[PDB]
Every structure is written in structure tokens, then in C-alpha cells.
Symmetry: D2
Subunit: 372 residues, 4 copies
């Protein structure tokens, strides 16, 4: 497997797995990494929905940042300042639960710019992204104010770009030759959307969550990579949740996109490559889902799991698995020398500072050796 090796002292070229941080991205290439493929139910094997997209022009984007996905994003060896633009398909915990971990952890990892978040409105103010993010920053006010004593506060801002959820395939983002468009989903209540990213002749579709709809098959047509939800079978719903037969039937017809519906949709879209996600991807679940899709779609298909990677080029759409560090650390990139604001008041009182324990004796041995 992989490219042929030419030198004992050289590299293995065109490697059969993707080692994040090890590959230069070509000017006419896209890398997409599944940083979470799961559900609102937690599991180490699958974080909740998250996608990292890297373009050959140097721009990078996150599409969804569900609970648990930051451990996968942090394994990519990408400096924090390169991942400041986030797009949310909807305001479920499994699609933005880890925004707070990017916000706080990225600020500790030396991010010098504010985060920038694009997400949908709702039917009223308190159902949309601007309200959600305002209240998320209030929720973590203790952490904001205590960090801002010691670290310049500018990177702790989150600038929200709210867009109209109702718009049919309209632009929500345009910069540097990169466009994102949105169109609606049918999921739980008004607000959720799908995105299409367009850049340099490519189109990548991030379906988010939806029951089958008339918008995705039209607006996604001809995508280089098209992602859509694909549910566990009704039989598996009965096995794994002890659901009554008629509810397990409804889950796959009314609430979610069945494997067979996913296949009809992708047969309509005719992407270069389709991606099913948002199912538990296990030895006893994945084959009947794949069979369901294959009833109606014969084209190239990935059954997503965490750390699956797609390389999109003019000639190919290649699936690999990423092999990345579980013992991850932040990596440094370019940044400003951002100086703490001396004008900000201490968040300690003297009552707390008066409690310090004298540890001079126990630290003297290492302190002497380290200072010399």
C-alpha cells in the first residue's frame, strides 16, 4: 500500500494513512477530516459531529464542533490561530458542545485572534445563534474574567455572524474566493441548515442533521464530497434501545434520514464521493446501514468514523484514516506579542490570598538546581 519508497534515508511517499502535520497541502487541493461522527450519547470511539476543512489557499474552517471533538481537532498539529472560523449547522449540544473547549483551550494554546462563528437564526431571537453564543459567554464568565487578568482578553471574544436559516441556497460567508451557502433542514424545529463550501472549482457539502428534504438533493448536486446523516436501522433501534416496533419504524421515516433515504438522496446528487455519518459505527451496526444505502446509490461512498480523512484533487477523492497522537499537545504558529492589560482588576480578594501555604523548605532543593 502507499507510494513506492525510493530511499532508505527518505520518506514513505503518498502514505496509506494520514499523519496530521506531516503533509504539505497543494494549492488546488482540499483536506477534510471527520473530527466527530457520533450522537448526543458519548463514547470514546466517536465524538459528536465535527469537521475540519483545509483549503490549498491556506484558509481552514471548522464545520460543527460537537461534544468531545476537540480532543480529535487538537491531535491535528494545527496552530490555534489557524482555526478561528467556525460554522454551526445547528444549536444541538452534539454540534457545538465543544465550542467552549476551542474558546478556552485555544486561548491557553496562544490564540491571539477572537473566534468567528457563523450559525443560523431561529424563528425568534432566543432560538438563534447570536443569542446562544451571547449566553455561552455569560455561562463561562468566571473563566473569561479570571483568564483576562493574566492573558490579553482580545482572543476571548467570539464574534457571531448570524444568517437567515430560511434562505434557499444563499451565501452566508464570502472572503478570499471562498463561499459558504446554506439551505434549510427539517430537524426538531426551525433553525438547522446544511452548508455548501465553494472554492477553486470545488464544492463540499456539510449536511448537518435532517429528515429527507427537497433542498439538499437540488443544492448539493455535483458536490466533490457530500456529507449527510444516515441513521441506524429500525431493527437496530429495537435491539439497542428496546424500542417498540412502530416507534423504531417512525425514527427512520419521520425524524431521521434512513440508510435507504440517504441512498436515494445521493443517487439524486451524483457527488464525486458521498459520506454517511451520525450513526454508531460498530461491528454489529455498520453492514446493514451500508446495505441500506446500496439499495439506491452505487457511487463512491465512505461510512464515516472519527479521524477519517478525504483528499480532494482534480483527479481523485481519496479516503484514508488519520493516525494521530492520543497524548496531544498544542503546537505554536505565528502570532502577535499580545501583552496583558495591566488596567484590569485582580479577581482575588486578600481573604483568599491570605491562605497561601509556606512551601519554601520543600521547593528549595529543585529551585536552587533549576535557577543555576
Amino acid at each position: 500500500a502507499g507510494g513506492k519508497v525510493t530511499s532508505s534515508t527518505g520518506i514513505a511517499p503518498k502514505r496509506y494513512v494520514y499523519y496530521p502535520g506531516s503533509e504539505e497541502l497543494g494549492p488546488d487541493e482540499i483536506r477534510v477530516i471527520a473530527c466527530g461522527t457520533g450522537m448526543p450519547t458519548a463514547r470514546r470511539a466517536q465524538a459528536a459531529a465535527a469537521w475540519v476543512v483545509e483549503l490549498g489557499n491556506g484558509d481552514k474552517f471548522i464545520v460543527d464542533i460537537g461534544s468531545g471533538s476537540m480532543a480529535n481537532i487538537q491531535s491535528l498539529m494545527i496552530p490555534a490561530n489557524y482555526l478561528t472560523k467556525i460554522f454551526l449547522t445547528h444549536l444541538a449540544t452534539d454540534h457545538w458542545g465543544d465550542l467552549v473547549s476551542m474558546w478556552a483551550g485555544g486561548w491557553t494554546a496562544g490564540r491571539t485572534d477572537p473566534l468567528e462563528v457563523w450559525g443560523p437564526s431561529g424563528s425568534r431571537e432566543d432560538m438563534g445563534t447570536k443569542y446562544a453564543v451571547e449566553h455561552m459567554l455569560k455561562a463561562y464568565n468566571w473563566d473569561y474574567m479570571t483568564r483576562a487578568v493574566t492573558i490579553n482578553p482580545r482572543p476571548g471574544d467570539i464574534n457571531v455572524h448570524e444568517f437567515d436559516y430560511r434562505a434557499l441556497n444563499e451565501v452566508v460567508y464570502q472572503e478570499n474566493g471562498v463561499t459558504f451557502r446554506s439551505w434549510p433542514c427539517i430537524h426538531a424545529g426551525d433553525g438547522p441548515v446544511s452548508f455548501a463550501l465553494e472554492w477553486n472549482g470545488y464544492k463540499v457539502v456539510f449536511g448537518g442533521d435532517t429528515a429527507p428534504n427537497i433542498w439538499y438533493p437540488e443544492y448539493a448536486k455535483g458536490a466533490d464530497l457530500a456529507i449527510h446523516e444516515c441513521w441506524m436501522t429500525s431493527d437496530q433501534m429495537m435491539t439497542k434501545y428496546n424500542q417498540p416496533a412502530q416507534l423504531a419504524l417512525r425514527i427512520n421515516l419521520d425524524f431521521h434520514t434512513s440508510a435507504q433515504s440517504f441512498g436515494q438522496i445521493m443517487n439524486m446528487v451524483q457527488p464525486r464521493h458521498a459520506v454517511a455519518y451520525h450513526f454508531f459505527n460498530d461491528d454489529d451496526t455498520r453492514y446493514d446501514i451500508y446495505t441500506g444505502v446500496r439499495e439506491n446509490y452505487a457511487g463512491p461512498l465512505s461510512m464515516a468514523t472519527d479521524m477519517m480523512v478525504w483528499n480532494i484533487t482534480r483527479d481523485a477523492v481519496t479516503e484514508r484514516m488519520a493516525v494521530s497522537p492520543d497524548h496531544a499537545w498544542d503546537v505554536a504558529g505565528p502570532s502577535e506579542d499580545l501583552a496583558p492589560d495591566r488596567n484590569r482588576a485582580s479577581e482575588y480578594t486578600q481573604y483568599i490570598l491570605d491562605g497561601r501555604l509556606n512551601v519554601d523548605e520543600a521547593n528549595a532543593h529543585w529551585k536552587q538546581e533549576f535557577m543555576g
Copy 2:
């Protein structure tokens, strides 16, 4: 290793690893599981701070629920209704970021009771736990309102019990023979606390985060299990973070508890068993940290990592590793599922419902075969 096997068709007794869901808890026993042992930066090897404590009287408590920890909590095969009481040392993201995943995922997993959260006040209303959780629920208003429409919303409430962070070893919880006391920490700004859990002649101390302070050595004295922050070394801060020598010195003398200070503290405490946590536990960091602790503390010691487990009995405190499923699922408990008493409004518009795709033909084959 482990207990001696006596039968080919029997079990392996007193097993050398802990399989969660496989062991009964005796009435004079405590199990503590580290579900997160890391830092504000994410990595699959170590979730952020989180502890599950199981008492022989059937009561279970979570102390801290940092980002990434719910994937470890869900691996324990514990019904969601047994995990409704949560204690927060402080409002850092690495100590309660996954409360939202417990709230929404626990509800998906069949919790029927509200969550109950105990956490500190701050120096002002907006720096305290009540404000924090109130605004976390506003931040997730779209998810709450869309989940709630046709069910009893009861499991989606969070009842907060805020206590004065300044109180010196005062009772913040007293129920069914169990007490928790808090006392202050010195960490980032006013508000953080440590807990002591007392039950059935046992005392378990959850230090949270602190620079060395006069309170923990007094109020933790004689604990069966004493958990405290223990930082990476100044040499490691220079190696891993490229900190200047002076700042790397300060980190272990002013901001955090050095390994040497941790040893001093645990020599003062004389616990049955000490636990160091809140460092990256890697092959090139753990040994220099352990050495620093052993300068001043000779007693029983655990260098925590994720899914480490302590069994506390009258005669021993035993450290094991848990071996748990990465491909986790929720488990059902005694279900007390209550019908809604009240109509709520749909969060759909006809504009969105008008978008449903006809997928009848694609689903006809599985639908017919499944209905028979």
C-alpha cells in the same frame, strides 16, 4: 495477577483490572473512578477533570465534569438516573464543560429526574455557579425547547445549590448519611473550592485546583483518599511550552502546586492514599513529577490517569485500571418515565415542513419486510 481461578466455567475473582458493570459494591465500600485527569488543552488520552464516586449505600456523585469526560462516564454502564448529583470545584471549562453533555445526553439516555448541581459562588453574582448554569441553559435554549415539545420537560431542569466559596469546611450537602464540606482554594480568582465527602467513617477529598494553601492540609487530614493538583515541572514547561526560565519558575511557585509542594501537603495530611492529578501523564513527564512528590511524601501514592479506579475498604485502598468500552452505549435502569401534564408549542413552521422529500419507493422494500 488477580485472584486465583477455581473453575473453568466460573469467573476470574478479584480481577487485576476493573471491568465497569461487572462488580457489586459492598455496603462498607467506596469506588472512585478518575473520568478525567487532564488540562484545559484537549487530548484523547486525558479528558479534563472528572471523578465518579460510588458509595456502598447506592448513592453516586460526580465531582467535576470537564470537557471530554462524558465519553469515560458513559463507558461505566451506569444508568443515567443514578448520575444526577454533580459537585463543581470551580467554573473553569476543564471542570464543568461537559455538564451540557450530561444534561442533553443523559436526557437522551433516559434520565427522568432533574440534574442537581452544587457549586461555589464567586465574589459577585456573575462569577458564581447559579449565574453560570442559568446562562448555560439559555445558551442551549434551541436544544431545550425543541427536545421539550411533546415530552415531560422535568429531566431538562437543573436545580442549582450555590454555596459561599469563603466558608471554612462548612457542610454544603447532608443527605442519607452523606456529607460534603467545602473550603477555599487559591486559583485564578476567588471562587474555587475543595470538597471533603464523609460517609460511614470514610473521608474522600477532591482538591480541585489550588496553589498551596493552609486550608487543605488541615481539613483533608486523615482522608482515606486525598486528591490534589500536581503540576508538570518548570523544565517541562520550558521543553513543552517554550516558556522563559523565569515564568516557568513562577508557574510552580505562585500559580500551581509543584510536585514538591504536593508532597509537603500529603506528608501534612497523612492520608491512607494520595492521588496526584492535573498533569499530562506521558512517558517523558511522569517520572520527574513522581520524583518531586517523593522528595517530601513516602506514603501510598497514585499518579492519576484516565480510568484509574480506587476501591476503599476498612483494610485497604487498592488502585486498578478500568477496562471499559470505547464503543459505549447507554444502559437502562428502573424506568420511572412520566407523561407530559401540559401542552407546549411546536417549534416548526409550515415553511420548513413543506420541504419533506417523498422517499416512499426507496423505503418500500425494508418497510414491507420489517412490518412482517
Copy 3:
């Protein structure tokens, strides 16, 4: 998933994964564990071919013990004295390379009985099992003779039971109500066989390796569990190995059982449950292999990977994954307490014993503490 929990202090019953050592085996039950499922190319995800069979009468068998499989067998928490009977399908390294790891490691562990090995003859003496094991013990003569100075020699023996590879469905083992039958395979050259284990109304078939043959479909009919080789697709052979189209075609037609041929064979066998193995079980290979099988076979089907487990009961054949310790240890069982044979010569010469380094002062501190 799994059975309903009824107590906070109790167990999770009928668990959705198999924790080895945690479940009693019923008197009318079989457990089969795949301890290796791969190929002669090594990989941590898949040890070479190996199966552990546990019957409700207390008998346990290994069927094949390919390179890399002992790490999986050791993870089961089965005492060495319970796993002394080994059946080999054929003498490829990927079916008995880890016989030496079983031999040496169990001897150090406290195994007190010799290993017993059943395997096929070949077309001449040097192509059969008796010859193979005779020469393997001579190959490891250094390790045999040295270990036999300090550990009783009895468990260091290997007793071989060589059976005629040409026999059609003849008994090769019959003891305590368990029968093994063999029949021929078509694989590389003469000698390889398949096995059927019959006990207490159950039939388990271990196919070993073969191109499609007239014997398996007749002699395997109505097995409770039927295991057969199932190959990667010709398109996969071209992607992964850069084989030209003509050689890639011949691999699935002449040398190995294609997924489509597996499906035909299992359609003829009508087992309660079929197991496909001996292919690399990866995100970009597994789906098309399952697809191939489903062209011709619609019954219950497992796509094997390491540590998959089947429970065979009168009512069901259930697939689960095992969740088992990577940091494995031997578990003690019933064993004799045998002195070393003091009549055997030391294998040290005085030339070597003259080189001992005086380390008394370096070891005196711990030696004293440990003395008391």
C-alpha cells in the same frame, strides 16, 4: 443496550460487551473468541488466525495459534492449565507461529501439563505436523534446556497427535463427549484441513484456509457456527498491492475463496450463524467484502475481527466484542507444585559464572527493608 440494571450497588446484567473472566459459562452454552483473524502480513489490529473455544462441560480448545495471537489469548484471564489442547488446520506461520509463545510463556507462568497438539500429515513425512513440532522443539533447544534447569521439565513437552489429512470427515479426537472431525482443504499444497467440533447437540466448524471445495459444504451442514476464509476483493488487491488485473482476478477465482463463493458455500451449509475471516478488516475494505457475501447468502453473518465473541445457546447465536486488558498478566488456576529436577546439569559454565558483578552495596537498602 445490554440487560436492564436493577440496583445501583449491583451488576449490569447480560452486558453489551464481553469482559473476559467476568461471565460464568452455562452447561448448555459454547463461547468462541476470535483471537486472530488476519494474514501472514503483521498488524496490531489483527493477529494471525486463532480461535478459543470454551464448552459448558469445562473443556477448552485452541484452534490455530497464528503469529501475534497469544497477546489476545492472554487477555482472556484463562489459566494456562485450562488451554493445553491445540488443533492446527495447517502449518502456515499465520496458523501456528505463536505455538512457541504459548509453550514458553505458560511454562514460566506455572502450566504443569505438556501441550497437546493435533494437526494434519502431508504428502510425505517432512510436510506434516509430527515433523514440524519435532523440529520446532529442536529449534528452541536452548530455551528448553535452560528453562528445564530451574522449572520442572514435564510442562516443557509437546505431545503431537498427527492425523491423516486426506480423511473425509473422520474422527481425530473423541474424549468426554467432545468429537473433532477433519476433512481436506485446497490451499497452497496438500495437508491443510477444516475441523468440526461436536458436543452436546452443537456443531462448530473451523474452516481454516481453502479455495472453494466440495467437502466443506457437505460436512459443515447445519453448524451452529461456521467459520470460512473470505478474501479481499480483486479491486482491493489492485489498489493495495498494485497487482495487474489478470493476477488480481486469479486471486479470487483460483487461490482463495471470494466473498461471493463464501456466500454460495454458506447458502449450501445453512448454519445458524456464519463467520467470514482472514481479510484485513479496514474502513475501505470491509463493506465490499460483506456486499459480495450478501449476493448469495442472506442468513446471520459476522465479519470477524480480533476479539469478536460468539455465545452459542439453544435459543440464539449472539455476536459481541470483547473488551479486554492490553496490559495483560497471567491469571493463576489449579496447578501442581513441582520441584525442578536437581539431577539435570546446569547449562552455565564456570567461564560465564566467573563474570558476576558485586552489586551488594547497591542492593543492601531495599534488601534490608524487604527482609523485614
Copy 4:
């Protein structure tokens, strides 16, 4: 951690983990990878002893190839023809049990040259490496003869270079600027040796197994990297193996190098970097072992575990962990075409070949589609 990133579309330089196949090797550099660090009992966390050494001149060597280690070696993305020179410290199963996997697997992975094996004699013919390997090839005669039928048998040759185990620090290999010397060990019986590899001003010492001896401290002096056996403690032999206090004592004095002895030895050697190996490296074993070393040795130290890597340069010896594929595949390098010009007889009889099942119909659909 790691080098500073300079470009969004570039690499992360000087990475904090080693991704095998991703780094060029400099002409004044060595890489050593621990491909096995464990014991004669198996566990997925630790293969038995094995080391891969890569020199900046393009030469590569394997030192020991214990059971389980080939899954690690195959994860390095090294072509099989670059790994044909193997050095054995001794003929324990935990040091050469996977030679047969390298022989068979490396042949299916495309090796075109014979293996070349250097190993010690013993005190008589049947206790030496030449005897051992000749008998190993007989043991696997069925696999050899069936593989060889239509192909050049050249890669299936093993050329043995047996050296006198008694020699004190004499040359056993000298080619292309690389020298290996051997000297004796005191381990189980006569035969075991240690190696020193010298190249380009570097010295790397592979201790193999030994009780403390007068040879290693003299001949390993000033090594860049010195590897030596470092045993589990006597208290651990009692806890983990249920050994009586008197035997637990003897194991760390008579039979093995204690952690304290290891520290004495490395204090004598004064290497640039010491490596302790051959202990189970677990959360409850590693710290007491490390403490025992530090009684006597203060210098740079690694506590080996599998896939630990050292980069030896003029300015540093750097420890990292390797992050490599579990789902490993062979990689191609620069190859022969080979061509046999001696005949070999078929190993099939017509009795076996007449057993072929007709599967034409079941294979017709895929076969037609494919040929187009």
C-alpha cells in the same frame, strides 16, 4: 510542543511524536525504535524484546525479534528488503520467536534477498544459533515448500553468521563503516550476549538479558544509548506472581538485574542516555522500578515501552513516542523482478485438486463487471 509552524499549507516541523515513514534521516543521525519491551508472557501493550536501528548511511538492523514484535516492525512503513539483517542476543522465545514472521511475512511483503542472521553459539552445537535456525526452517518446511513452488526461493534463504559467545568485545560484523561487537551475559545458561553497534562516532549498546556482570560496565562505557534489562521489584513478584518472599528475593539478586543494579551499572557506564527495558510498564509497576534506578543513577533515562523512539544526534539524545498504524500494510521499495531458473515440483496431489467446488454462477456478475 514540537517545532514552530510557519505555514498553514506546510508541515509541523520537529514534531513532538514520531510518525514512521514521515521523517528523512540525516547523515550524522541514528533512530532507534523499541518494537518490543516486554516479557515471555504476551500482552497487546508490550511485544517481546525487539529493536530497529536506522543509520544515516542507509543501513538498518533489527536487534532481537521476540514474539509479537512484527506488528510493531510492520507499522514503520519500511520496505522488507531494507530489514534483512537481524542480530539475536540469545535464543529465548521472547528474543527471536517472530523471526519466522519476518521470514514468511517479509517474503509476502516482497523481500527479494535472503535474511541474514547473526547470533551466538552455545557451549555445544545444539545450544547455538546455527542449529536453532536450521531447525526453525525445518519446522516450517510445509510453508516454505508450498510458498516456493512457482517463485524464486532466494528470499526464503536464511544465511546464519554464528559467532563465539565467549569472545570478550570482539567484532562479529564489520561492513560499510558499521561495526558490531559482542560480549557475554549471565542469563539462564551459556550463550547470551550483549552487542555494541559503532558507526560515525556513535555507540549504541543492546544489552539483551543478563544478571549484573563485569563485562557490560567496561565494554558499554560512554555509549550514546545504553539499553539494559531492568527487572520488576521483589514486592511486585509477590503481588503479581504470588511468589514466596525467599524466591521473590532471589529473582532480583541471582537471576535478573534489579532496578538498583541497573542504576549501579549505568553510573559505571556514564552513557549519554540509559534505557531500562524488560519489565511490564504499568501504572502500578513503573514508579517503584524508576525509584530503584534513581538510588544509584542520576543521568538521562528512558523507561522503555513499545514504540518508544530515540533520535541520536551530535547535540542530543531525544526520546519520543512513535504514532503508527494499527491497520498496517506492507510498503513497496525498489525491487528485482527475480525469475527462477530451477524447477520445483507441485505440492498438490490430483486427489486434493479434484475437490474443487464449481462457483462460476455465484462469481459471474462481479467477474464480468470487473473485466471491463
